[PDB]
Ligand SMILES: CC(C)CCC[C@@H](C)[C@H]1CC[C@H]2[C@@H]3CC=C4C[C@@H](OC(=O)CCC(=O)O)CC[C@]4(C)[C@H]3CC[C@]12C
Ligand SMILES: CC(C)CCC[C@@H](C)[C@H]1CC[C@H]2[C@@H]3CC=C4C[C@@H](OC(=O)CCC(=O)O)CC[C@]4(C)[C@H]3CC[C@]12C
Ligand SMILES: CC(C)CCC[C@@H](C)[C@H]1CC[C@H]2[C@@H]3CC=C4C[C@@H](OC(=O)CCC(=O)O)CC[C@]4(C)[C@H]3CC[C@]12C
Ligand SMILES: CC(C)CCC[C@@H](C)[C@H]1CC[C@H]2[C@@H]3CC=C4C[C@@H](OC(=O)CCC(=O)O)CC[C@]4(C)[C@H]3CC[C@]12C
Ligand SMILES: CC(C)CCC[C@@H](C)[C@H]1CC[C@H]2[C@@H]3CC=C4C[C@@H](OC(=O)CCC(=O)O)CC[C@]4(C)[C@H]3CC[C@]12C
Ligand SMILES: CC(C)CCC[C@@H](C)[C@H]1CC[C@H]2[C@@H]3CC=C4C[C@@H](OC(=O)CCC(=O)O)CC[C@]4(C)[C@H]3CC[C@]12C
Ligand SMILES: Cc1nc2nc(C3CC3)nn2c(O)c1NS(=O)(=O)c1ccc(C2CCCCC2)cc1
Ligand SMILES: *[C@@H]1O[C@H](CO)[C@@H](O[C@@H]2O[C@H](CO)[C@@H](O)[C@H](O)[C@H]2NC(C)=O)[C@H](O)[C@H]1NC(C)=O
Ligand SMILES: *[C@@H]1O[C@H](CO)[C@@H](O[C@@H]2O[C@H](CO)[C@@H](O)[C@H](O)[C@H]2NC(C)=O)[C@H](O)[C@H]1NC(C)=O
Ligand SMILES: *[C@@H]1O[C@H](CO)[C@@H](O)[C@H](O)[C@H]1NC(C)=O
Ligand SMILES: *[C@@H]1O[C@H](CO)[C@@H](O)[C@H](O)[C@H]1NC(C)=O
């Protein structure tokens with residue numbers, strides 16, 4: 001998918017407890033302390049000064065006059081530079097494109113009931129295989145809907161996915177993993193970060209009662225126990241994408257604008273509230 | 281290519297293909313600039 | 325109702341107390357008994373070992389023990405347990421098709437980071453802090469020394485200018501008047517900017533003291549390859565992973581370490597890893613992954629290796645082999661093994677799996693808040709110092 | 717908000733917003749009424765977040781990287797699979 005960024009992406013750099021204790025408890029306590037220092041300029045002005053210093057954007061403030069008040073403002077400015085450093089240090093990685101899978105799994109409502117969706121879901125599998133038999137046995141309705149958007153081969157399904165004529169491709173897990181690994185640019189990926197449903201295996205078929213069955217089983221088990229299977233998997237099954245800065249759009253960082261909108265609403269509400277208080 | 285696998289099985293190492301404080305020597309340049317500023321201020 | 329030994333510790337009278345068994349394998353066994361109607365009678369293996377072919381001290385004889393021995397000697401009839409399918413066991417008993425695919429992996433203790441109170445002073449060495457503190461004041465006094473004796477700034481104004489420029493606070497809105505003081509103050513501002521930027525560039529790194537020292541890159545990492553006294557890594561004694569390590573002629577250098585430290589059962593090994601007695605535990609992917617999911621302070625770090633599957637082993641000539649294998653395959657094909665995974669393995673309470681940079685927490689930066697509190701409790705005295713100064 | 721307060725001209729408000737967005741200090745004079753003293757400071761936070769987000773990856777976009785040029789021996793995917 002193109003991916004998505006959560007509206008709170010700009011807010012996780014600190015935990016909720018840290019945010020609320022800095023901007024409610026610590027800040028108001030420090031503002032009250034600044035007033036106590038200066039008195040011995042309204043409290044709104046002290047809160048305004050501290051908040052402007054939290055992120056110094058040259059916002060106009062009214063500095064206090066007492067020396068102790070100036071010292072406390074200095075240590076608050078040190079706390080503010082700590083806060084800005086910690087917040088901006090990892091902000092770029094936190095506001096990053098997060099890729100969410102289209103479907104959770106084979107039991108998702110998109111597969112089970114594709115009709116109750118304004119855009120239809122296009123998923124299919126090649127016929128005459130184990131996957132088709134499994135889907136027919138488990139989900140007859142899903143298989144009946146799937147037969148319409150059938151496929152001819154693995155490469156045909158892959159190019160259908162690439163162009164856009166098909167959305168999902170249900171197939172053998174190992175072949176799909178190999179295709180995802182060998183794919184360039186990694187536009188194709190299996191959901192669930194390697195989700196496997198039937199979890200069977202590849203076997204060497206033999207006639208019933210064949211004398212070669214026991215010897216072949218023992219030889220294969222010896223191969224897997226000697227590490228040769230790992231070597232073969234590295235030689236053949238491994239791919240490109242397995243071993244694995246962008247422009248910012250409105251959708252990328254819409255949360256900051258959401259915060260600004262909430263502030264616009266709150267400002268209008270408090271304007272009406274102040275008018276009501278003044279009138280009455 | 282068997283020699284490559286032998287040498288990566290035996291002759292391979294740890295430091296191959298492999299959070300520090302800042303002392304005064306790291307900040308030597310900025311302090312030298314400040315000293316030059318003091319000297320320029322005195323001569324001016 | 326499963327009748328098993330009472331005391332796990334060796335050298336104790338192992339009374340056969342009837343406990344009760346439940347979980348993945350028990351549910352699978354009940355399903356098997358339902359699909360092919362046979363009656364079962366579960367009983368735990370006498371000794372906690374999974375079972376390997378061992379040389380008894382009576383020479384010229386190899387014996388199977390554990391669950392393998394209990395099945396081969398006729399005491400048992402079917403091993404419904406996470407029995408790994410390997411060549412050594414397959415020669416004597418026949419396994420069904422795997423009902424769970426997994427592999428060996430390494431479980432280690434996830435280091436919880438500790439937040440020192442001097443974390444934010446950590447980026448600068450203490451001599452640098454002292455030097456910058458002295459520099460602030462020498463520049464501050466020299467501003468007013470230059471300004472006062474100027475043919476063309478008081479003490480407080482100069483000090484506040486220097487400190488506010490360093491801290492970026494704007495407390496002192498007093499600019500120097502003399503030219504030389506102008507160059508001196510502006511270059512001091514530049515130096516303060518560079519110092520602040522250099523401090524910022526590593527404040528976050530020094531705030532969280534996490535390094536990938538304990539991170540293990542599978543079994544190919546040197547810390548597993550090269551034994552050491554401190555790095556105590558182990559497995560369950562007398563199990564499938566022990567057979568795998570012994571069989572590997574190339575990895576026998578590891579084996580010399582494995583035999584030195586081994587544990588009676590998986591629970592003891594994971595407890596030892598939890599209590600930092602152990603540095604690494606080699607065990608099956610399923611068990612280690614579930615333990616990491618539930619016991620949240622341990623992490624599975626090793627790259628997956630020796631991919632195999634748990635099999636419901638029976639005797640060499642058992643009438644149920646074909647039917648039990650067919651039943652396992654049928655359960656795999658429909659949504660039964662998935663149900664068992666969901667209800668026994670997939671569930672978790674926390675995973676802590678996120679490659680994003682660590683989120684700052686309250687315990688991580690308590691030093692900053694305590695520094696602000698110290699500023700509060702120092703200013704509360706500075707008020708009295710100021711009034712006393714006003715008295716004089 | 718300030719003009720219709722129960723108890724800051726256009727140019728001064730313009731300068732306040734511009735100097736808050738990009739910290740230059742041209743905006744002199746904080747908003748008088750409380751209704752604006754909350755919106756203005758939230759706008760200051762918005763400006764800080766925007767500036768920090770723009771700054772965080774400015775050097776990467778100033779000089780383009782070399783993703784494809786970084787060949788890695790014969791294990792290169794653009795070498796292994798031609
Ligand atoms: C009245 C004066 C002193 C201003 C007080 C500031 C608070 C009104 C703001 C500042 C920071 C705000 C917090 C900043 C971030 C947190 C985390 C945030 O949790 C998340 O990380 C996102 C959760 C989600 O995805 O919905 C929830 C709000 C909250 C508590 C905020 C609650 C409101 C806060 C405390
Ligand atoms: C001045 C004070 C009183 C207000 C400070 C603003 C923030 C505390 C509010 C304003 C807007 C709030 C956000 C607006 C809406 C978003 C989306 C909202 O939905 C989700 O992100 C869920 C996942 C998804 O939808 O993709 C979650 C909260 C959150 C981050 C909010 C988090 C808290 C916000 C930032
Ligand atoms: C008075 C309040 C309740 C509404 C007006 C608040 C304003 C401050 C506007 C200005 C711009 C508005 C934003 C501009 C457009 C975006 C996209 C908009 O739709 C999308 O996210 C899809 C992508 C796209 O629109 O391009 C969602 C709101 C949002 C954040 C807006 C939120 C409200 C904003 C911030
Ligand atoms: C000392 C005199 C020349 C006063 C004029 C400049 C001053 C502002 C001092 C303050 C700190 C002094 C620096 C502090 C200590 C260093 C270490 C020192 O570097 C070395 O080569 C010796 C090894 C070491 O001690 O680290 C000498 C320079 C220097 C940069 C000093 C240069 C002169 C500095 C900048
Ligand atoms: C805690 C560690 C990091 C050292 C920090 C030192 C500062 C907290 C002290 C040391 C010297 C103090 C200064 C020394 C004396 C001056 C003059 C002094 O002049 C007055 O008392 C009258 C002020 C007026 O009313 O205008 C004012 C404080 C001040 C700036 C002090 C401010 C606070 C200072 C810088
Ligand atoms: C470079 C890109 C981002 C566009 C830059 C826009 C500026 C060139 C314009 C837009 C808005 C203009 C301001 C908007 C209005 C104000 C008030 C205005 O006050 C007046 O006396 C005329 C209007 C009135 O009667 O209030 C003076 C200009 C000024 C500062 C303007 C200055 C020039 C501005 C900033
Ligand atoms: C060795 C050590 N172990 C610790 N365990 C803890 C924890 C979690 C509870 N903290 N901690 C340490 O902080 C140290 N280091 S210290 O004793 O040289 C030291 C002490 C105090 C301060 C200031 C920091 C600013 C506020 C005022 C106190 C600075 C350095
Ligand atoms: C799957 O199997 C069916 C047969 O069960 C194949 O259908 C045949 O297709 C060929 C070529 O189109 C025709 O000549 C035959 O007459 C078809 N036989 C029947 C009974 O339909 C189908 O082609 C196979 N599909 C794939 C992709 O393997
Ligand atoms: C294993 O399963 C097969 C198939 O269900 C069983 O074979 C059936 O047995 C019944 C009862 O004797 C007969 O009526 C059927 O005709 C048999 N069908 C086949 C395919 O042979 C078999 O009895 C089961 N054996 C075990 C070990 O329980
Ligand atoms: C985003 O997804 C849509 C489908 O919803 C697709 O048409 C479009 O091409 C995607 N954007 C990109 C980056 O191509
Ligand atoms: C047997 O089990 C009981 C708990 O049911 C325990 O208290 C007792 O000590 C055990 N006896 C042995 C074998 O020591």
Ligand SMILES: *[C@@H]1O[C@H](CO)[C@@H](O)[C@H](O)[C@H]1NC(C)=O
Pocket residue numbers: 361362363
């Ligand atoms: C098992 O099922 C058969 C019917 O298929 C029944 O006749 C028999 O009594 C049942 N009991 C056993 C254990 O054979």
Ligand SMILES: *[C@@H]1O[C@H](CO)[C@@H](O)[C@H](O)[C@H]1NC(C)=O
Pocket residue numbers: 381382
């Ligand atoms: C040999 O094994 C038997 C049975 O476990 C034990 O009783 C005996 O003490 C052992 N002898 C030696 C020399 O280990």
Ligand SMILES: CCCCCCCCCCCC
Pocket residue numbers: 506507510511514
């Ligand atoms: C009239 C004021 C002139 C001030 C010159 C300051 C030069 C600072 C150099 C900083 C280089 C990073």
Ligand SMILES: CCCCCCCCCCCC
Pocket residue numbers: 044047048051753754757758761762
């Ligand atoms: C005079 C009261 C000022 C209160 C300022 C609150 C600003 C909240 C901004 C939140 C940004 C995350």
Ligand SMILES: N[C@@H](CCC(=O)O)C(=O)O
Pocket residue numbers: 126127128129130131132171172
């Ligand atoms: N491994 C599968 C390939 C075909 C499919 O997945 O449908 C089989 O032999 O049946």
Ligand SMILES: CCCCCCC
Pocket residue numbers: 453456457490491520523
């Ligand atoms: C001891 C003085 C510390 C100043 C820190 C400025 C970032």
Ligand SMILES: CCCCCC
Pocket residue numbers: 071074075078487
């Ligand atoms: C007034 C100086 C405060 C410094 C805090 C580190």
